Amino acid sequence: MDPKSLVGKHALVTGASRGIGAAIAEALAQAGARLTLVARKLQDLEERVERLRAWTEVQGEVGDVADPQAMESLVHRAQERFGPVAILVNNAGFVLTAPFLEINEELWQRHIEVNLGAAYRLIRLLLPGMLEMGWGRIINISSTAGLTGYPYAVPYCAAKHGLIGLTRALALELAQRGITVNAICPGFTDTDLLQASVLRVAQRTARAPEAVLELFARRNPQGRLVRPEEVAWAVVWLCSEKAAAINGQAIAVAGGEVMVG
Amino acid sequence: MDPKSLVGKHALVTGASRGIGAAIAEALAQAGARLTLVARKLQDLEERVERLRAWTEVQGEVGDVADPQAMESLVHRAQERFGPVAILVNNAGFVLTAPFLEINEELWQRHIEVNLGAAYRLIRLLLPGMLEMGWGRIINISSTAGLTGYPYAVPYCAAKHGLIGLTRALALELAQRGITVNAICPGFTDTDLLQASVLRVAQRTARAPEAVLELFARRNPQGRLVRPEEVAWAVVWLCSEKAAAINGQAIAVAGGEVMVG
Amino acid sequence: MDPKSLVGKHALVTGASRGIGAAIAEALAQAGARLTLVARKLQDLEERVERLRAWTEVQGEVGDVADPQAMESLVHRAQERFGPVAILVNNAGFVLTAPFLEINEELWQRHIEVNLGAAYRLIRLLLPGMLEMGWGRIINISSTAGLTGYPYAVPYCAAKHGLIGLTRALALELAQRGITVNAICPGFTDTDLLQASVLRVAQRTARAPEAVLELFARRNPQGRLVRPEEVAWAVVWLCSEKAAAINGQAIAVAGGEVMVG
Amino acid sequence: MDPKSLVGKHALVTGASRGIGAAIAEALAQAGARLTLVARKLQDLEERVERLRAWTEVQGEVGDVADPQAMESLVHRAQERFGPVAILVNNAGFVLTAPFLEINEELWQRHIEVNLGAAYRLIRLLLPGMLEMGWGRIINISSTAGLTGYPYAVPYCAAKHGLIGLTRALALELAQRGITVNAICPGFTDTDLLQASVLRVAQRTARAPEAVLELFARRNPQGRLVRPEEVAWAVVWLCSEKAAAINGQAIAVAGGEVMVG
Amino acid sequence: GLVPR
Numbered sequence A, B, C, D: 001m002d003p004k005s006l007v008g009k010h011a012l013v014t015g016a017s018r019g020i021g022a023a024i025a026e027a028l029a030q031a032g033a034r035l036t037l038v039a040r041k042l043q044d045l046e047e048r049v050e051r052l053r054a055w056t057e058v059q060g061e062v063g064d065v066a067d068p069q070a071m072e073s074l075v076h077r078a079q080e081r082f083g084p085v086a087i088l089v090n091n092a093g094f095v096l097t098a099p100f101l102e103i104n105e106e107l108w109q110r111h112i113e114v115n116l117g118a119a120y121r122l123i124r125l126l127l128p129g130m131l132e133m134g135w136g137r138i139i140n141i142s143s144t145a146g147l148t149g150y151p152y153a154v155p156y157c158a159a160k161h162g163l164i165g166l167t168r169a170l171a172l173e174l175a176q177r178g179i180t181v182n183a184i185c186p187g188f189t190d191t192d193l194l195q196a197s198v199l200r201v202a203q204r205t206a207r208a209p210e211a212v213l214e215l216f217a218r219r220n221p222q223g224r225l226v227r228p229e230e231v232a233w234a235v236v237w238l239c240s241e242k243a244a245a246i247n248g249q250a251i252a253v254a255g256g257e258v259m260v261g
Numbered sequence E: 001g002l003v004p005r
């Protein structure tokens, strides 16, 4: 009567080879979920898949979430091996900070398509299987930029806010279908993406990278960056049957930077 | 005429031939703004322009806000008579309620492009003129669907929430440039769009249109639909110089259906 | 706003001899409301009443909002001269920042009583008259501390958040009774009290007052303090009949410091 | 969750003999925490203590959270057996719904004192011990009434919103002290008390209890009541070291009734 | 069943 885990559940995690996505995949692997991991670069993805095979059955699929044809094929292949996806984690993102007048059509569309469009399409592909099983979890990794504004991140904020809107509406539409839909909203988290953003902001503001890293930690009242495992801890909590009442929520993992209500 | 608050200010209102947009245009005309009214159909637009010439200088421009080429030409033509736009009201919207699995790519894109992409593009075209003048107002007409979820309106909620994100981020980026950026979030409002939505929902749920109308009014704690002039009243208030401290806000006009904080 | 809009409406403003309350009283006076002003010190109250008689009929009553017996007598006297109160502005507040462990019972209770308990009692006294007239406006001056946390202001944040709770619940309870209940949430505002505090810190730290003012304004994205007239402008807007659809709202007047939703 | 996670942590839960508090105590007992349970009636408290001794060391203390002298003595006795309190759960509350004009001083004060004043006092008593240990968890059980309004629950909403304000401000004040402060906001929960109310209304309206339950659950998009164990699951998740980044948050456990941001 | 959870 003691084993209450995710054994026998197929989870698909996008952007799963490094950072937050990798920590989410590790937590789901330790919980017993069968995993389909998606990322564009083979090298990091293969290492992640091999590492997590110590805890569960894992398969990796090279793919860009913004490519609909590649994603349909990827999802079809993944479900042939591990069956319908019960848990979907939309984690792959895109951010390029710049003054609003420097955001041309291409850059606006890339923010919308990677952060929001991709989640819409993947949910549409995997929702029939969840409805058939009578159980599911859809977890969207948004950001504190989905809950409040940030200057120089207008398309990122627009797309991440749109992801919260998708989350809330779908949570209500699926409320009596056995599926919950929630968003996890990290603040600045210690990842390779954040280190790339540190150098971009330093170059754009004529500041030393170390000084801008200290500014990033100062947005968090706790005076430190969020760890990827703390974001993953929120994700695995939502997958339990005792989190069924958590639906349509945005969980901020930012030390108090944004206090939801 | 005694009301001279916005005298001389060039205001451009999208979707201004009928409904909320026409009421916004009327309130701005009574306050003394010079108006550029945009809509797709010339017939209703020309009649609206002629009506509002009783209070101020008005011109109409035919265009679809989702057509980038037509909007760039439209903006060049509009600035010939009244100069750079000081007040921009992004009001044109799009909604088609349906179950999430019935939202194909084209329908998803129409919700994103009309409600969000169009506002991004028009702000990008008109922001340089506002920055040159050192003063401006950007007002985005979102919805209570930009603040909470509604079942069967997943793309509408995603786009309207994305519009709130654009509003918040741009309010911070422009905070010290003499421009405020805010969103007005109406609940169900008595317009041709709502009447068309009532008939569509009634046909799709096998209910009498009158019963669906009463259900829509029941969401408003006040027991009635919002009037277009009530949404317009919030818009004109934001254009005052005394509303400079109102920035990055979402003003719900829904009788208490959504209570912002 | 027209100088005849609120003619024939008796408005009562608490804490109205100085600061935000004085600015609220002035804006209501310019809109044509008959005013009852309440404050504890006679001299400042008499001067404010005399100043506002340039625009409308004004009367003053000396009183402490935390004294129930004094407030009942005061309210009875005010209504004998100007009739039932149609508009109530709960503006008198209390703040004393300190580390949480230094908040003794009595200091905790003073924050709750002045900012929240007093508003409950005064609304209870004046609500019957509003229900009899079939129209009313209850406007609670909360703070950005009613919408987010601040360190060393735990009782102030608790009381100001409590005032939002009272606002929201009462807005729903009175939604179909012709009365709206709303809250205005200022950020740091430029008053004589704040200027005295700026000068004291400048004198104690050997800094120019302008350097200390920059610290105080740092949370405002607009780089300046909120002006009392900007808070007052939001109050008068809510009193119009065209703001009937604005109910249960918290309007942040803080330049973008808090972005409500 | 592992049955050894919180071993060696002294947790104190107020209002722990029945309902949500009893479920919170049970989940903490299964996680290995040493428990101090507080409630006014001895019989129900003794039964709960005896039941939970199957999983961990438990002690009961008879007391009313609104009695400062009894609570100080209680806390001294409790810390003599299990040492300083590391985890505090403020769960004891009070609600008596009524039309606003029928709320006298005593009824208003009982809502403020039991739901908010008592949490302030108990946190003030136990915070020194948490600061000395360098680790702590303060979890306040608020309600969806802390995040939105409900008609006829004005004092309850005011007090529960005040508890969110206390949570937010204290989370910022203690951010760098090793202590997190969060609030859990349940919607209507299936307790024996609620089932007795369902049966009373069914008996008074000649309806099957299942028909009356549907009215109570109507606000929950999931079409059911929240289970006490779902509220408890959120509490134990917050106590983990991996939830250190969760600070100043309000976690709604209401099926999507309130969607936080 | 082989891997502990």
Ligand SMILES: NC(=O)c1ccc[n+]([C@@H]2O[C@H](COP(=O)([O-])OP(=O)(O)OC[C@H]3O[C@@H](n4cnc5c(N)ncnc54)[C@H](OP(=O)(O)O)[C@@H]3O)[C@@H](O)[C@H]2O)c1
Residues within 6 Å of the ligand: A014, A015, A016, A017, A018, A019, A020, A021, A038, A039, A040, A041, A042, A044, A063, A064, A065, A066, A091, A092, A093, A094, A095, A114, A141, A142, A143, A144, A185, A186, A187, A188, A189, A190, A191, A192, A193, A194
């Ligand atoms: N780090 C922060 O401070 C922060 C703050 C707020 C929110 N977030 C959100 O957290 C999520 C993950 O961010 P992160 O910081 O972990 O980023 P990261 O360290 O750069 O990792 C991103 C992962 O996603 C993959 N990826 C990137 N673009 C992809 C695409 N188009 N298709 C498929 N996979 C893709 C990357 O692998 P390949 O490059 O090989 O494809 C990698 O495995 C994002 O949604 C982000 O917006 C992060």
Ligand SMILES: NC(=O)c1ccc[n+]([C@@H]2O[C@H](COP(=O)([O-])OP(=O)(O)OC[C@H]3O[C@@H](n4cnc5c(N)ncnc54)[C@H](OP(=O)(O)O)[C@@H]3O)[C@@H](O)[C@H]2O)c1
Residues within 6 Å of the ligand: B014, B015, B016, B017, B018, B019, B020, B021, B038, B039, B040, B041, B042, B044, B063, B064, B065, B066, B091, B092, B093, B094, B095, B114, B141, B142, B143, B144, B185, B186, B187, B188, B189, B190, B191, B192, B193, B194
């Ligand atoms: N219940 C409600 O009515 C409600 C609730 C919440 C939010 N809103 C929002 O309020 C705004 C206005 O809605 P409404 O109810 O007033 O609509 P409406 O009665 O249908 O009027 C819409 C107006 O915009 C024009 N328009 C529509 N699509 C356009 C496009 N692509 N380009 C340019 N003009 C366009 C229409 O004229 P043409 O057809 O000639 O172009 C018309 O002048 C929208 O953003 C909507 O989402 C409405």
Ligand SMILES: NC(=O)c1ccc[n+]([C@@H]2O[C@H](COP(=O)([O-])OP(=O)(O)OC[C@H]3O[C@@H](n4cnc5c(N)ncnc54)[C@H](OP(=O)(O)O)[C@@H]3O)[C@@H](O)[C@H]2O)c1
Residues within 6 Å of the ligand: C014, C015, C016, C017, C018, C019, C020, C021, C038, C039, C040, C041, C042, C044, C063, C064, C065, C066, C090, C091, C092, C093, C094, C095, C114, C141, C142, C143, C144, C185, C186, C187, C188, C189, C190, C191, C192, C193
């Ligand atoms: N100033 C800010 O930056 C700021 C920011 C956020 C919110 N607020 C809120 O705005 C409101 C007004 O504050 P303020 O800054 O304008 O204050 P202020 O400059 O100190 O003025 C307070 C006014 O209220 C009166 N007053 C004070 N305590 C009173 C009491 N117990 N009973 C009756 N009258 C009383 C004062 O006159 P007497 O002393 O003669 O009684 C004076 O007329 C408060 O609710 C406050 O919490 C202010």
Ligand SMILES: NC(=O)c1ccc[n+]([C@@H]2O[C@H](COP(=O)([O-])OP(=O)(O)OC[C@H]3O[C@@H](n4cnc5c(N)ncnc54)[C@H](OP(=O)(O)O)[C@@H]3O)[C@@H](O)[C@H]2O)c1
Residues within 6 Å of the ligand: D014, D015, D016, D017, D018, D019, D021, D038, D039, D040, D041, D042, D044, D063, D064, D065, D066, D091, D092, D093, D094, D095, D096, D097, D114, D193
């Ligand atoms: N319409 C109504 O009249 C109505 C409806 C609902 C609730 N209520 C009131 O609201 C109160 C709280 O309701 P509830 O939903 O929390 O249910 P409850 O079962 O009364 O209380 C929950 C738990 O907290 C304990 N408790 C209650 N008040 C306490 C206090 N002041 N100090 C310490 N422990 C306390 C209870 O045990 P003990 O009772 O043994 O202390 C129980 O273990 C009720 O006690 C009742 O007075 C009234």
Ligand SMILES: [Mg+2]
Residues within 6 Å of the ligand: A259, A260, A261, B261, C147, C259, C260, C261, D261
């Ligand atoms: Mg907020």
Ligand SMILES: [Mg+2]
Residues within 6 Å of the ligand: A261, B259, B260, B261, C261, D147, D259, D260, D261
């Ligand atoms: Mg809300």
